[PDB]
Swiss-Prot record, chain A:
Source taxonomy: Eukaryota, Fungi, Dikarya, Ascomycota, Saccharomycotina
Localisation: Cytoplasm; Nucleus
Quaternary structure annotation from Swiss-Prot or TrEMBL: May form a homodimer or a heterodimer with a related family member. Interacts with OLA1, TMA17, and UBR1.
Endpoints of the signal sequence: none
Note: Present with 4700 molecules/cell in log phase SD medium.
Family to which the UniProt record says this protein belongs: Belongs to the AAA ATPase family.
Part of the full-length chain shown: 52 to 102 of 405
PTM entry text: N-acetylated by NAT1.
Function: The 26S proteasome is involved in the ATP-dependent degradation of ubiquitinated proteins. The regulatory (or ATPase) complex confers ATP dependency and substrate specificity to the 26S complex.
Protein name per UniProt: 26S proteasome regulatory subunit 8 homolog
Originating organism: Saccharomyces cerevisiae (strain ATCC 204508 / S288c)
From Swiss-Prot, chain B:
N-terminal signal peptide: none
Physiological role: The 26S proteasome is involved in the ATP-dependent degradation of ubiquitinated proteins. The regulatory (or ATPase) complex confers ATP dependency and substrate specificity to the 26S complex.
Residue list for modification Phosphotyrosine: 35
Localization terms from the record: Cytoplasm; Nucleus
Ranges in coiled-coil conformation: none
Protein species of origin: Saccharomyces cerevisiae (strain ATCC 204508 / S288c) (Baker's yeast)
Protein name: 26S proteasome regulatory subunit 6A
Similarity comment: family membership: Belongs to the AAA ATPase family.
Included stretch of the parent chain: 146 to 217 of 434
Modification after translation: N-acetylated by NAT1.
Curated annotation (Swiss-Prot), chain C:
Post-translational modification: The N-terminus is blocked.
Localisation: Cytoplasm; Nucleus
Protein name: 26S proteasome regulatory subunit 7 homolog
More about this protein: Present with 105 molecules/cell in log phase SD medium.
Job of this protein: The 26S proteasome is involved in the ATP-dependent degradation of ubiquitinated proteins. The regulatory (or ATPase) complex confers ATP dependency and substrate specificity to the 26S complex.
Family statement: Belongs to the AAA ATPase family.
Quaternary structure, from the entry: Interacts with UBR1 and CIC1.
Source species: Saccharomyces cerevisiae (strain ATCC 204508 / S288c)
Highest taxon, organism lineage: Eukaryota
Swiss-Prot record, chain D:
GO CC term (a single one): proteasome storage granule
Residues annotated as binding Zn(2+): 92, 94, 105
SUPFAM superfamilies linked to this entry: JAB1/MPN domain
InterPro entries: JAMM/MPN+_dom, JAMM_MPN+_peptidase_M67A, MPN, RPN11_C
Name of protein: Ubiquitin carboxyl-terminal hydrolase RPN11
Domain notes: The JAMM motif is required for the deubiquitination and degradation of ubiquitinated substrates.
Pfam families (UniProt xref): JAB, RPN11_C
Keyword Membrane in annotation: no
UniProt keywords, alphabetically: Acetylation, Hydrolase, Metal-binding, Metalloprotease, Protease, Proteasome, Thiol protease, Ubl conjugation pathway, Zinc
Gene this chain is encoded by: RPN11
Family under the similarity heading: Belongs to the peptidase M67A family.
């Protein structure tokens, strides 16, 4: 049962809508972070709960 | 050619495009000063008209004589 | 001397570092026509140039 | 009291679903559209019995790319065949983008909502339906004023539903500022099941039909060799597998993918493959002569 039902949990993981890699240039203490996205431009954008 | 941007199909044909810098070449209705508001250096005016202007109009006399017209 | 070295660090770390946005005190209401300039397509415009 | 709006679930008959997919993928990336013929009964069921496609344009969707002249001719074609009921809305296919209504599409929808309030817009993603999931989501316009008064909670009353949000990003912007999305259930009959499940004429031609026996020998050779390599890898691993902490052993003596597990998958496929094949040979040889 464990073997078959992690696969069902793993479909969500595989069907992620993308990611990106960024690097934090600096924070701003408005509770947002300046991210120079590595392939892309600069966007100041909201943090999650995790960080 | 036009290609339809929703789905690439040759839609129709369009004139060939040249740069806007090359589209600045042609006249604005460019003022004329004829040969008669250029005084002095008479011999130069005659030498230019001969080189450029008359081989355009009398290209027929150039073909019958059989000469070529100059390149600049 | 080394106690001074550490506590300068600690003071910066807790205070936090930032960059503030330019503002205006006469503005405390702006979105009355913020949404008139924004909010769907009415529109900030993709810039082009005529070539022919 | 006023009129209260509440949950609905859009039941896409098996017929309707294939047509949208067929018409939509074929016309992608140019936008595809068409009307949904069906009936509303109940107060929780939008039942879409059929769809058809309205002629494509290279202006894509537009309020004037709907085209009622074509709608009218088509309606009379269903009328003569005794299939007309009520047009229950419109669908359109965004190409490879998500399910969300465009600003233009909101105004296309506002028109059909006048004609019947229970009309939906069904946004289809065909280039994303080639997964193991078919991606289709449904929307239905709600009055802007109603959203101010907090009447999005109203739409989920009297069941727990199967409530889940399959897509956000542009979707959750448009929900917030316009619409109430619907979940999608499928209707099909017991006849239609049998039609769908059947997909081969070789159902009875697949255990008497066999593959060339050179191909089988190649396969046995390939299989045995592969497991021979995995066994050497396993043997390196199982020189220890006896110290404290499983995780330390997995790094150190590669149990990265577990050569035990890896050998089990490979063993089991070719073992099962050979039992069928021998059984096919022995059936034909004895029975036929």
């Amino acid at each position: 049962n464990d073997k078959v039902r992690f696969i069902k949990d793993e479909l969500r993981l595989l069907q992620e809508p993308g990611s990106y890699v960024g690097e934090v240039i600096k924070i701003v203490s408005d509770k947002k972070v300046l991210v120079k996205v590595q392939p892309e431009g600069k966007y100041i954008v909201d943090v999650a709960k995790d960080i | 050619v036009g290609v339809n941007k929703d789905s690439y199909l040759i839609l129709d044909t369009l004139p060939s495009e040249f740069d806007s810098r090359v589209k600045a070449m042609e006249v604005d209705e460019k003022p004329t000063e004829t040969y008669s508001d250029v005084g002095g250096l008479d011999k130069q005016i005659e030498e230019l008209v001969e080189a450029i202007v008359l081989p355009m109009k009398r290209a027929d006399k150039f073909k019958d004589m059989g000469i070529r017209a100059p390149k600049g | 001397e080394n106690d001074l070295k550490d506590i300068e660090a600690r003071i910066k770390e807790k205070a936090g570092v930032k960059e503030s946005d330019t503002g205006l005190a006469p503005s405390h209401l702006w979105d009355i026509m913020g949404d008139r300039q924004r909010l769907g397509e009415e529109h900030p415009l993709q810039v082009a140039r005529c070539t022919k | 009291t006023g009129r209260d709006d509440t949950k609905e679930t859009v039941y896409i008959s098996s017929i309707a679903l294939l047509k949208m997919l067929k018409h939509g993928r074929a016309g992608v990336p140019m936008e595809v559209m068409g009307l949904m013929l069906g009936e509303f009964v109940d107060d929780y069921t939008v039942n879409v019995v059929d769809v058809f496609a309205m002629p494509q344009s290279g202006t894509g969707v537009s309020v004037e790319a709907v085209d009622d002249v074509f709608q009218a001719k088509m309606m009379d074609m269903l009328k003569q065949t005794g299939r007309d009921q009520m047009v229950v809305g419109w669908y359109h296919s965004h190409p490879g983008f998500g399910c969300w209504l465009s600003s233009v599409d909101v105004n296309t929808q506002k028109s059909f909502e006048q004609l019947n309030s229970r009309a939906v817009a069904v946004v289809v993603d065909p280039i994303q339906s080639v997964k193991g999931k078919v991606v289709i989501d449904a929307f239905r316009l709600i009055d802007t004023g109603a959203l101010i008064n907090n009447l999005e909670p109203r739409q989920t009353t009297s069941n727990t539903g199967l409530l889940n949000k399959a897509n956000i990003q542009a979707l959750i912007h448009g929900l917030n500022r316009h619409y109430y999305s619907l979940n999608i259930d499928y209707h099909k009959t017991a006849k239609e099941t049998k039609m769908l499940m059947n997909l081969h004429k070789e159902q009875w031609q697949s255990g008497l039909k066999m593959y060339d026996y050179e191909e089988k020998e190649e396969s046995n050779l390939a299989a045995t060799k592969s497991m021979v390599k995995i066994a050497e890898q396993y043997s390196k691993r199982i020189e220890e597998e006896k110290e404290l902490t499983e995780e330390e052993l997995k790094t150190r003596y590669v149990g990265r993918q577990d050569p035990k597990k890896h050998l089990s998958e490979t063993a089991d496929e070719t073992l099962e493959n050979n039992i069928v094949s021998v059984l096919t040979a022995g059936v034909n040889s004895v029975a036929i002569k």
